[PDB]
């Protein structure tokens, strides 16, 4: 049996001093990075004046000779939307391959009338790209109805001539401007003109981010065929005068990541070597493009092996990009220069600023890391670039510097830095095809600066170029970009020739972070401190984590019944690692039923003392516990990994979530709780095994901070991390009498639920067990004679809808993560993928290919993607479902499991193709994705089908089209919506989490209504209000006044104002995402009145919160609602058979205590969802305007929209 | 239509143009239910006309118009109310219903 | 353009024929100018060969 974590994440090679200096700089504070760069980039006053003069000369030439689209817009008086729509139409017409066919369609069908009739795929799928071309502004999603209107308008106004001009424009742009050519042969033909003028070329075959083995093989053969064509054309010109190729390592392997480093070195490296061997034979350059920051150091391991490989000796064409916007850049250069010296290879080093800036900001914020791996002020990148050029120019004997930039100021600075001595081969400049030629035609040639320029030349079809064209446009198109500024008439040449080195040198704090970019720790500002994660791409972090994880496996973890009086005796058994039952993680002593009942009585005795701790001090306990969990995170990770079968990545996020719960509920307490918000009393917190620290901590922390003593009943499968959480909370100051841990099975849970002093239950788990708890609680009333509150957060049958406008590679990554992360053992996991028919086969092929790249095994290795399921019984249940589907003839795709999985309980990630959504009839809590296909016109019916399961937890939509977003999000009934991203990993206070129907009672965990459920009088949550008044409520209040029910009419109007229906907030979170929180109607509320006035109050409460009602016909109160306004009557039904008229979304009950108890039992017996029931006596309705609390009559909806999905962040284009 | 607004000129020609900015991403939900009902009946041409009406309807348009500082000048498209339908044929009635429902109206 | 240039004379007629104050008459002529320019622009944005007159 392999020792735990003995092979967690060993580096590819021992880290040299130079490699360690790189890692040390990964997230170095910006104020520490800049001073040495300022010093390295400093030049004499004479040189700075000469450079400013050169830059001015270049900029004057640029502005003196200065679009095709702009002239088209002008000629036909197009609006911006018409220009975009026209280019989308032109793009579509160019998907028609035959020219004569296209021209006939234009003349005879498009121009004369309905373009829609002739052109499964929206015309406007790529309109975000064309929007950038036409307007310079990025929008993440497409207003396809505005574009359709604009296209109809422009065609009806201008006819065939404008279509012809648009087609010719788009043909030129996509065939000659965004690419040098559609194929490498075409690109080579078009390169001769500028090669004769002294330019050179590096061809970019536009591949990246392979999703499957087949994709990677396709990109490989594309590079190989390109190298032959380029090498044939080079014809012995060599690596400096002749053309070369650029490759992206992410194109050549579907799992190019540090976590998969062994596969990268074993499988990706030989492919690069084979391409490099061919480049060597033709003697052309082969450049490795730089990608995301978490791939930098991994790529150095490939560069090292290749440069030391004797089979490649004799060739100096290997090239490597370094990104000056990265904090490691100078240290990477030191490493590369030294590698060039050791290997004797003159490495071609392309210095760039960097293409992934927005994405790096978003990633570091999402991951809660210490700092960014890139600068946050554009001027810092400029100084970094110049400083790194100084380093490169001192080493031209051993490397070949290649200064890629379109910035005339940067260029001029380096031109003068390099000095007067030049020869071809010493260094070169580089630029992008169709972007940098205006500048570099002022540089290349004896009549200019007589310095060479290599043109980075994209090569590819329309489909290939459009895929990531947005990122490429933002490089030179953001407000801080030189190319954007040179075109801005409000930017002077003196501004453009400003010396970034001297500007930074003179700032008050050299290297200060951008004011408008939050460090990840500060995402929530003054509200609370964000939890911190760990960078599993950082070798220092991996090495320290390895030791902490090993040490955690040496610990004698135990879980005991921790009563107020001390630990109790009980039946003791071992806890085994679900991924390897030979690995004993610890021992649990389980609680007797007698001791569980004793614990409730002790909690009841202690309830006054804990309620008397002021809310601010209770919140301080939670904040202290959060600090303790943050400090203990590495040890907690190890326990979660081994006890719960989680990967390190998922364990980090789990501990972060627990920290966030603690800090969120602490802050919410400080915002709300006062003396009148009295605690319920002892609360039983029952938690699941799949989030054994986070949900455990969340429920307990909320109940405790609301002033309630807690009986914590963790899942029988995962008691050890629960015991450690309780230990931490007690260390943080929670008294033993306020937090008792009762390990054991459902018998312990049930004994707690049934105990007379139990004042509330927080349950997260299966819908079936929640229903059993609901039935037990319906037997009971509080001492005041009211229902015992139950928060029951249960399963989902979560769907994602994907239309033909979505990017398949994005979809597949989000599906693989959503469905199979944590072996599908998230309540949020994707269960049903719905693919529009026209793209379903392509996406399914990619999905199956991606499925087979997953590594399944014991989770104490970083390379493991999917761990075990929690128990053999879970495994058996999931497998029975798979075999039932297989026996029905459904196509089943499964990854093959390694033999080592036999010592644990594993289910292979599985894809099952269903005919109809109704083929799936129960939540299958495992790594099992079901796929259905739908016709575009059946989208609305499909949303009906998703809603028809009765669940309503998470839901995903992948589309670029605003009409589809509006339609689907308005019709879907789920608590957590996700647009153009995965559907898992809800973040406390950012995506408040929880659903409706069979998925939950609410209120949402990690949301602002949660604590109010845990006190007898709910406070007003922060930001909880709405200026909107339900119009049916208003009609009802007028009807009441017309009937003479003046007091009830006033109460109705007050309910209308008090309701927060219509609340619509954006919650603070990471850049590149919009996180929305809205309050909607719940649905149909069951009203069980006893008196006419009670009915009117119930109806006012329900209508004010947007609901319809079903009124108990057995109340005999039909004559009290005569002659209702039609608007109110539409919302009112009478029910004699409550079970037949559901599902309801809540209930309001009026009666004395025994009437309430009887009704509560009848409601618990209704099939389907657990209903949030509020009861009041007639006297309570008369005395208390809040007898029914409106918090529980609205439904919370969270929506998280990935606004970077189009390829960039529009808001951050204004941040420089 | 309103004088000094973008629908006005379209009343004065025999085929109305699409006015500037005249579109909406919202689809009437009753229109959607009607289209599905037509689908179930096999009324394929009418269901298509209904979906097309749902899309081309500008019900829900909500614009801020350029004007002086210190003022917000808003322009919005709502349902008209209840539309009188005088059909002759079943298909005509379905098309009339589609048009009226797509624009948020009762009939 | 003609109504703008001739606004003072138009004001005099509107004041005396229609009982308007000078301020109201200015706004009246402005509104006429704006109708002209607005419908001119709306036409340039929309009308093509298929939008036949009544
Ligand atoms: C031929 C060529 C090849 C290239 N290959 C690659 C590659 O393989 N990998 C790669 O990542 N990039 C690559 N780039 C660079 C990238 O695509 C952009 O073109 C480049 O960063 C633009 O910088 P600049 O000197 O042209 O223009 P500038 O306007 O001078 O610089 C713009 C750059 O500043 C940086 N920046 C913008 N805002 C901020 C901010 N708030 N804080 C910090 N920095 C900021 C960004 O890097 C941005 O791209 C290449 C560029 C060229 C010309
Ligand atoms: N909506 C959410 O936030 C959310 C979050 C996580 C998990 N879940 C759901 O949790 C389920 C998986 O977790 P699980 O397997 O631990 O669920 P579960 O219903 O099996 O177990 C949850 C808890 O209920 C307890 N329990 C079992 N029988 C009981 C009884 N008769 N009386 C009182 N308590 C009893 C268990 O001991 C455990 O602590 C899934 O269905 C998942 O969707 C929902
Ligand atoms: O996967 C989720 O969306 C999710 C939902 C609730 C709580 C969590 C979750 O994942 C992170 C840990 O705690
Ligand atoms: Mg269970």
Numbering used by the authors:
A (entry chain A): 14 to 79, 82 to 134, 137 to 1233
B (entry chain B): 1020 to 1126
C (entry chain B): 644 to 697
From the paper:
The proline catabolic pathway consisting of proline dehydrogenase (PRODH) and L-glutamate-γ-semialdehyde (GSAL) dehydrogenase (GSALDH) catalyzes the four-electron oxidation of L-proline to L-glutamate. PRODH is a flavoenzyme that catalyzes the FAD-dependent oxidation of L-proline to Δ1-pyrroline-5-carboxylate (P5C). Also known as ALDH4A1, GSALDH is a member of the aldehyde dehydrogenase (ALDH) superfamily and catalyzes the NAD+-dependent oxidation of GSAL to L-glutamate.
Fragments 7 and 13 were bound to the GSAL substrate-binding site of the GSALDH active site. The refined occupancies of 7 were 0.83 and 0.86 in chains A and B of the asymmetric unit, respectively. Fragments 7 and 13 engaged well-known recognition elements of ALDH superfamily enzyme active sites. The carboxylates formed hydrogen bonds with the backbone of the anchor loop (1000s loop in SmPutA). The carboxylates also formed an ion pair with Arg843 and a hydrogen bond with Ser845. The heterocycles were flanked by two Phe side chains, which formed the so-called aromatic box of ALDH active sites. The dioxane ring of 7 forms a hydrogen bond with Arg843. The cyclic structures of 7 and 13 were perpendicular to the side chain of the glutamate product and, thus, could not access the oxyanion hole. The most notable inhibition occurred with 7 and 13, whose poses and interactions mimicked the substrate GSAL. The data were fitted to a global competitive inhibition model, resulting in Ki values of 0.32 mM ± 0.02 mM for 7 and 1.5 mM ± 0.1 mM for 13.
